[PDB]
């Protein structure tokens, strides 16, 4: 097993064993699925200069396990390596889960905004901001507003109408969404306050 | 409470006139005639000027129910 190459106390040997994990991730699954203990040792070994990318392949390990949320957290802890590539199906899965997590956290922290909010992770907010920004800059505003509404950000609709207003009927499109679809006033206040300030 | 709770439901559910007949598949045929009466009235209320084409079909058997 290649896990021994990571088990050696040589940082260069660890690095060599963990380069190609992101390349054999597609083909080899069982050997990487059983090696959760080894990657935990590498993650704990934070004195080695490849902590971030070890957490990346740690998320790859949890890709094998099927725990997408745990892989999201491990790539979250890596930080800058959460967004290595912006176009893949596993990337789409993890961002969709992260948007759902951001939506739930935003709703509860807006329902109880008088302090004591659940800590909005800088690492999670950083990737979230990057993901819907590019989904707004992809220049497909027939779906950019739709994913923006799914993201459930208080200022995202204001951002959408302040940026390039492709298909200027999007203002009326979002008008009927807030008139008919969005009606639960408790968290609707974000969409409503933006709607009144523009119209 | 039974006849009331099956007639004053179209006030809430008229936003979904397609769901007026779906939530009464047991109320309109219930062994209690008052429950059937409320279910009938509920679809009438929630569909004021709508050609639902489904509430009418489900209300057609109730137009000749033995209970007055």
């Amino acid at each position: 097993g290649i896990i021994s190459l990571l088990d050696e106390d040589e940082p260069q040997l660890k690095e060599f064993a963990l380069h190609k994990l992101n390349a054999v991730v597609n083909d080899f699954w069982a050997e990487i699925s059983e090696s959760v203990d080894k990657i935990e040792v590498l993650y704990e070994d934070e004195g080695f200069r490849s902590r971030q990318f070890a957490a990346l392949v740690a998320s790859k390990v949890f890709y094998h396990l099927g725990a997408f949320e745990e892989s999201l957290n491990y790539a979250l802890g890596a930080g800058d390596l959460f967004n290595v590539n912006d176009n893949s199906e596993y990337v789409e899965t993890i961002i969709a889960k992260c948007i759902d997590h951001y939506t739930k956290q935003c709703v509860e922290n807006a329902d109880l905004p008088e302090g004591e909010k659940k800590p909005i992770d800088q690492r999670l907010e950083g990737i979230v901001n990057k993901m819907f920004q590019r989904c707004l800059d992809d220049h497909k505003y027939k779906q950019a507003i739709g994913i923006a509404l799914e993201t459930r950000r208080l200022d995202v609709f204001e951002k959408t109408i302040l940026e390039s207003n492709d298909v200027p009927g999007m203002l009326a499109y979002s008008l009927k969404l807030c008139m008919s679809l969005m009606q639960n006033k408790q968290f609707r206040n974000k969409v409503l306050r933006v709607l009144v300030k523009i119209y | 409470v039974r006849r009331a709770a099956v007639e004053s439901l179209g006030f809430i559910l008229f936003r979904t006139p397609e769901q007026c007949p779906s939530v009464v598949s047991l109320l309109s045929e219930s062994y209690n005639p008052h429950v059937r009466y409320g279910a009938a009235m509920a679809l009438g209320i929630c569909c004021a000027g709508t050609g639902n084409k489904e509430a009418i079909n489900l209300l057609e058997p109730m137009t000749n129910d033995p209970v007055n």
Binding site: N26, D27, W29, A30, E31, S33, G66, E89, E92, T93 | -
Partner: protein, 444 residues
């Protein structure tokens, strides 16, 4: 010339009948697209192999040129790849799409079937390179189009794709394709597609004997319960075979008898032969006497005759007789992959004999059991009964005075309750039957 002309006219008529079967398939997908019903789609896939045993290069080109009234990439691929015969006197009225039908683009579902129907046809013609190119075009088209109903199609499409690649010996290369489509199936919740790919993956590990990787993946991969019956049987048998290699005995016998029961009784002759061999070898090792009624299998008489002699050798405990027949007809056992087990049974024959004689006797002498099973050594007999009790298979104990063994006792608190405790899952079956009825009582 009259007999030859009549035979050619008759076979051409059956070719037209097969074309009408393919035309019926096209109408089935037209209804399927209109009704959004994948169940009637499954009927089309079920009925295809029934007529798949008799096709002709000419009638396939007839269906190709007819269905592709509008120029499309499928026709451009089949023009060089499909090699129709020379000029034939029989022609049909090829005009199925006219006006709006030709204007509308081709259905992705029928596009996947034509690609899958070519690759089955190429393998029927025993062609490899053209079969792999069509199949690669099939997975490329299915990957590009992201409709929900296509992934149900993609299950059997990826299934037969890797089956072709197994003949191509690309069964190692196709693993990247299998895993890549597994990730797509995981994203799209394609349980049937997932079920097929693991079955192909397990057969890949079987052909390379990559059992250590297979058990590490099966132990972590969850298999869908509601998957196809055939795919369930193949997965369960492969799981049963590897547990038998892994010495997971009680689980192996449970899985193999379930796999035999899940397989169709009228079909799966090759699958049936394998499960008879699997049950004979595993249960004889266990000492579980093989089912005598299984010997009445009309398709397994010659294979089970040495197996019958193996059963007799296991019961008797002799060595030389069955070693000779293994030297005679042990090559098929090697092909089945149980020869390492076969030798294991050859040396565990004494263990099985000890259990049966221990169940037979209350206080049997250690010298008597040694003489019965050809040990000729009091110490080896003591070791064997020591090794039997520590395995827990039998209750025979050791008293170094003369070899005492305890007897049974009257029924205790849990001895009347262990059946009901292990059998009260009847209501659990009842609830899932009722829940399936809940899922399957659509009124329209």
């Amino acid at each position: 010339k009259t007999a030859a002309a009549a035979a050619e006219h008759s076979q051409r008529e059956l070719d037209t009948v097969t074309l009408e079967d393919i035309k019926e398939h096209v109408k089935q997908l037209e209804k399927a697209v209109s009704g959004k019903e994948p169940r009637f789609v499954l009927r089309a896939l079920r009925m295809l192999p029934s007529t798949s045993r008799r096709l002709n290069h000419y009638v396939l080109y007839k269906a190709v040129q007819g269905f592709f009234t509008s120029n499309n990439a499928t026709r451009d691929f089949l023009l060089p790849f499909l090699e129709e015969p020379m000029d034939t006197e029989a022609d049909l009225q090829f005009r199925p799409r006219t006006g709006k039908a030709a204007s509308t683009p081709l259905l992705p579902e029928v596009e996947a079937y034509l690609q899958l129907l070519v690759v089955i046809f190429m393998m029927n013609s025993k062609r490899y390179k053209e079969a792999q190119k069509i199949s690669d075009d099939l997975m490329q088209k299915i990957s590009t189009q992201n409709r929900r109903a296509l992934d149900l199609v993609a299950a059997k499409c990826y299934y037969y794709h890797a089956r072709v690649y197994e003949f191509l010996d690309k069964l190692d290369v196709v693993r990247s394709f299998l895993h890549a489509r597994l990730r797509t199936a995981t994203l799209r919740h394609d349980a049937d597609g997932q079920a097929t790919l693991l079955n192909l993956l397990l057969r890949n590990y079987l052909h390379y004997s990559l059992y250590d990787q297979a058990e590490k993946l099966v132990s972590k991969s969850v298999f869908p319960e509601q998957a196809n019956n055939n795919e369930w049987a193949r997965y369960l048998y492969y799981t049963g075979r590897i547990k038998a290699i892994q010495l997971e005995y009680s689980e192996a016998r449970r899985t193999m008898t379930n796999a035999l029961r899940k397989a169709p009784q009228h079909t799966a002759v090759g699958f049936k032969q394998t499960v008879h061999k699997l049950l004979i070898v595993v249960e004889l090792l266990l000492g579980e006497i093989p089912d005598r009624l299984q010997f009445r299998q009309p398709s397994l008489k010659r294979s089970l005759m040495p197996y019958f002699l193996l059963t007799q050798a296991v019961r008797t405990g002799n060595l030389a007789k069955f070693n000779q027949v293994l030297d005679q007809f042990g090559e098929k056992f090697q092909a089945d992959g149980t020869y390492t087990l076969i030798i294991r049974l050859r040396h565990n024959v004494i263990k099985t004999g000890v259990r049966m004689i221990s169940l037979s006797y209350s206080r049997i002498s250690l010298a008597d059991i040694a003489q019965k099973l050809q040990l000729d050594s009091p110490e080896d007999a003591e070791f064997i009964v020591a090794k039997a009790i520590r395995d827990g298979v039998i209750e025979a104990s050791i008293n170094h005075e003369k070899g005492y063994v305890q007897s049974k006792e009257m029924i205790d608190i849990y001895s009347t309750r262990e059946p009901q405790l292990a059998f009260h899952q009847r209501i659990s079956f009842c609830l899932d039957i009722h829940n399936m009825s809940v899922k399957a009582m659509r009124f329209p």
